[PDB]
Amino acid sequence: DGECGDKDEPCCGRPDGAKVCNDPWVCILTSSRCENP
């Protein structure tokens, strides 16, 4: 809630370009949320 990088939670993409997700959650491009591979 109000956060980024967690399971089914939207990923916050940084100035360096990398989307914030804690491993092993991967942010899928359409869903824009860090979910399971």
PDB file of N, CA and C in Angstrom:
ATOM      1  N   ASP A   1       0.851  -1.208   0.000  1.00  0.00           N
ATOM      2  CA  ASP A   1       0.000   0.000   0.000  1.00  0.00           C
ATOM      3  C   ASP A   1       0.880   1.250   0.000  1.00  0.00           C
ATOM      4  N   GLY A   2       0.803   2.038  -1.092  1.00  0.00           N
ATOM      5  CA  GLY A   2       1.589   3.266  -1.248  1.00  0.00           C
ATOM      6  C   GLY A   2       3.083   3.017  -1.415  1.00  0.00           C
ATOM      7  N   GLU A   3       3.446   1.754  -1.687  1.00  0.00           N
ATOM      8  CA  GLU A   3       4.849   1.299  -1.787  1.00  0.00           C
ATOM      9  C   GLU A   3       5.100   0.741  -3.198  1.00  0.00           C
ATOM     10  N   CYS A   4       6.333   0.307  -3.473  1.00  0.00           N
ATOM     11  CA  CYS A   4       6.717  -0.193  -4.799  1.00  0.00           C
ATOM     12  C   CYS A   4       7.781  -1.282  -4.679  1.00  0.00           C
ATOM     13  N   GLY A   5       7.661  -2.332  -5.507  1.00  0.00           N
ATOM     14  CA  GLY A   5       8.687  -3.379  -5.595  1.00  0.00           C
ATOM     15  C   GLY A   5       8.278  -4.727  -5.025  1.00  0.00           C
ATOM     16  N   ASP A   6       7.082  -4.798  -4.435  1.00  0.00           N
ATOM     17  CA  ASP A   6       6.590  -6.010  -3.732  1.00  0.00           C
ATOM     18  C   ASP A   6       5.629  -6.820  -4.592  1.00  0.00           C
ATOM     19  N   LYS A   7       5.192  -7.985  -4.056  1.00  0.00           N
ATOM     20  CA  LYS A   7       4.342  -8.956  -4.779  1.00  0.00           C
ATOM     21  C   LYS A   7       3.001  -8.316  -5.167  1.00  0.00           C
ATOM     22  N   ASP A   8       2.771  -8.229  -6.496  1.00  0.00           N
ATOM     23  CA  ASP A   8       1.550  -7.659  -7.110  1.00  0.00           C
ATOM     24  C   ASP A   8       1.406  -6.159  -6.797  1.00  0.00           C
ATOM     25  N   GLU A   9       2.541  -5.535  -6.452  1.00  0.00           N
ATOM     26  CA  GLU A   9       2.628  -4.106  -6.116  1.00  0.00           C
ATOM     27  C   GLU A   9       3.449  -3.406  -7.213  1.00  0.00           C
ATOM     28  N   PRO A  10       2.968  -2.227  -7.778  1.00  0.00           N
ATOM     29  CA  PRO A  10       3.622  -1.548  -8.933  1.00  0.00           C
ATOM     30  C   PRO A  10       5.125  -1.261  -8.690  1.00  0.00           C
ATOM     31  N   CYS A  11       5.952  -1.435  -9.736  1.00  0.00           N
ATOM     32  CA  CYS A  11       7.407  -1.219  -9.651  1.00  0.00           C
ATOM     33  C   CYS A  11       7.737   0.246  -9.963  1.00  0.00           C
ATOM     34  N   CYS A  12       8.589   0.849  -9.122  1.00  0.00           N
ATOM     35  CA  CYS A  12       9.035   2.236  -9.273  1.00  0.00           C
ATOM     36  C   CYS A  12      10.354   2.283 -10.071  1.00  0.00           C
ATOM     37  N   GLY A  13      10.262   2.698 -11.351  1.00  0.00           N
ATOM     38  CA  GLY A  13      11.427   2.801 -12.237  1.00  0.00           C
ATOM     39  C   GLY A  13      12.240   4.057 -11.947  1.00  0.00           C
ATOM     40  N   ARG A  14      13.556   3.879 -11.768  1.00  0.00           N
ATOM     41  CA  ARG A  14      14.468   4.931 -11.284  1.00  0.00           C
ATOM     42  C   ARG A  14      15.050   5.769 -12.456  1.00  0.00           C
ATOM     43  N   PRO A  15      15.724   6.951 -12.168  1.00  0.00           N
ATOM     44  CA  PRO A  15      16.491   7.729 -13.189  1.00  0.00           C
ATOM     45  C   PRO A  15      17.531   6.899 -13.986  1.00  0.00           C
ATOM     46  N   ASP A  16      18.137   5.888 -13.326  1.00  0.00           N
ATOM     47  CA  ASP A  16      19.096   4.956 -13.978  1.00  0.00           C
ATOM     48  C   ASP A  16      18.368   3.914 -14.859  1.00  0.00           C
ATOM     49  N   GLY A  17      17.031   3.876 -14.764  1.00  0.00           N
ATOM     50  CA  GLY A  17      16.187   3.084 -15.669  1.00  0.00           C
ATOM     51  C   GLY A  17      15.682   1.781 -15.067  1.00  0.00           C
ATOM     52  N   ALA A  18      16.415   1.242 -14.069  1.00  0.00           N
ATOM     53  CA  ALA A  18      16.075  -0.056 -13.461  1.00  0.00           C
ATOM     54  C   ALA A  18      14.810   0.069 -12.583  1.00  0.00           C
ATOM     55  N   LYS A  19      13.833  -0.820 -12.835  1.00  0.00           N
ATOM     56  CA  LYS A  19      12.572  -0.898 -12.075  1.00  0.00           C
ATOM     57  C   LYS A  19      12.844  -1.581 -10.727  1.00  0.00           C
ATOM     58  N   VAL A  20      12.390  -0.962  -9.617  1.00  0.00           N
ATOM     59  CA  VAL A  20      12.603  -1.517  -8.267  1.00  0.00           C
ATOM     60  C   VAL A  20      11.617  -2.659  -8.006  1.00  0.00           C
ATOM     61  N   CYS A  21      12.187  -3.849  -7.794  1.00  0.00           N
ATOM     62  CA  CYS A  21      11.487  -5.043  -7.319  1.00  0.00           C
ATOM     63  C   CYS A  21      12.465  -5.835  -6.449  1.00  0.00           C
ATOM     64  N   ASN A  22      12.003  -6.342  -5.300  1.00  0.00           N
ATOM     65  CA  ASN A  22      12.818  -7.237  -4.462  1.00  0.00           C
ATOM     66  C   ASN A  22      12.789  -8.646  -5.080  1.00  0.00           C
ATOM     67  N   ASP A  23      13.944  -9.337  -5.080  1.00  0.00           N
ATOM     68  CA  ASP A  23      14.067 -10.681  -5.665  1.00  0.00           C
ATOM     69  C   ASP A  23      13.241 -11.702  -4.836  1.00  0.00           C
ATOM     70  N   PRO A  24      12.560 -12.703  -5.487  1.00  0.00           N
ATOM     71  CA  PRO A  24      12.619 -12.962  -6.949  1.00  0.00           C
ATOM     72  C   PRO A  24      11.463 -12.322  -7.769  1.00  0.00           C
ATOM     73  N   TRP A  25      10.774 -11.302  -7.202  1.00  0.00           N
ATOM     74  CA  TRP A  25       9.658 -10.616  -7.894  1.00  0.00           C
ATOM     75  C   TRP A  25      10.196  -9.816  -9.101  1.00  0.00           C
ATOM     76  N   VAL A  26       9.620 -10.075 -10.283  1.00  0.00           N
ATOM     77  CA  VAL A  26       9.932  -9.376 -11.538  1.00  0.00           C
ATOM     78  C   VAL A  26       8.722  -8.542 -11.984  1.00  0.00           C
ATOM     79  N   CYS A  27       8.965  -7.254 -12.290  1.00  0.00           N
ATOM     80  CA  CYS A  27       7.935  -6.348 -12.812  1.00  0.00           C
ATOM     81  C   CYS A  27       7.720  -6.614 -14.311  1.00  0.00           C
ATOM     82  N   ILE A  28       6.548  -7.180 -14.651  1.00  0.00           N
ATOM     83  CA  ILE A  28       6.156  -7.454 -16.051  1.00  0.00           C
ATOM     84  C   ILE A  28       5.652  -6.144 -16.689  1.00  0.00           C
ATOM     85  N   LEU A  29       6.004  -5.903 -17.971  1.00  0.00           N
ATOM     86  CA  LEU A  29       5.865  -4.575 -18.616  1.00  0.00           C
ATOM     87  C   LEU A  29       4.400  -4.095 -18.733  1.00  0.00           C
ATOM     88  N   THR A  30       3.465  -5.015 -19.010  1.00  0.00           N
ATOM     89  CA  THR A  30       2.041  -4.669 -19.184  1.00  0.00           C
ATOM     90  C   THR A  30       1.388  -4.383 -17.810  1.00  0.00           C
ATOM     91  N   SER A  31       1.576  -5.320 -16.860  1.00  0.00           N
ATOM     92  CA  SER A  31       0.973  -5.254 -15.509  1.00  0.00           C
ATOM     93  C   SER A  31       1.613  -4.144 -14.647  1.00  0.00           C
ATOM     94  N   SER A  32       2.884  -3.819 -14.974  1.00  0.00           N
ATOM     95  CA  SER A  32       3.727  -2.809 -14.294  1.00  0.00           C
ATOM     96  C   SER A  32       3.837  -3.051 -12.771  1.00  0.00           C
ATOM     97  N   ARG A  33       3.692  -4.329 -12.347  1.00  0.00           N
ATOM     98  CA  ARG A  33       3.773  -4.745 -10.926  1.00  0.00           C
ATOM     99  C   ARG A  33       4.792  -5.884 -10.761  1.00  0.00           C
ATOM    100  N   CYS A  34       5.541  -5.851  -9.642  1.00  0.00           N
ATOM    101  CA  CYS A  34       6.543  -6.874  -9.311  1.00  0.00           C
ATOM    102  C   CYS A  34       5.841  -8.154  -8.828  1.00  0.00           C
ATOM    103  N   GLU A  35       5.713  -9.143  -9.712  1.00  0.00           N
ATOM    104  CA  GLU A  35       5.017 -10.411  -9.422  1.00  0.00           C
ATOM    105  C   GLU A  35       5.953 -11.606  -9.663  1.00  0.00           C
ATOM    106  N   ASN A  36       5.442 -12.835  -9.480  1.00  0.00           N
ATOM    107  CA  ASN A  36       6.252 -14.061  -9.612  1.00  0.00           C
ATOM    108  C   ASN A  36       6.595 -14.336 -11.102  1.00  0.00           C
ATOM    109  N   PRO A  37       7.864 -14.782 -11.414  1.00  0.00           N
ATOM    110  CA  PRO A  37       8.263 -15.206 -12.787  1.00  0.00           C
ATOM    111  C   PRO A  37       7.340 -16.324 -13.354  1.00  0.00           C
TER     112      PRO A  37
END
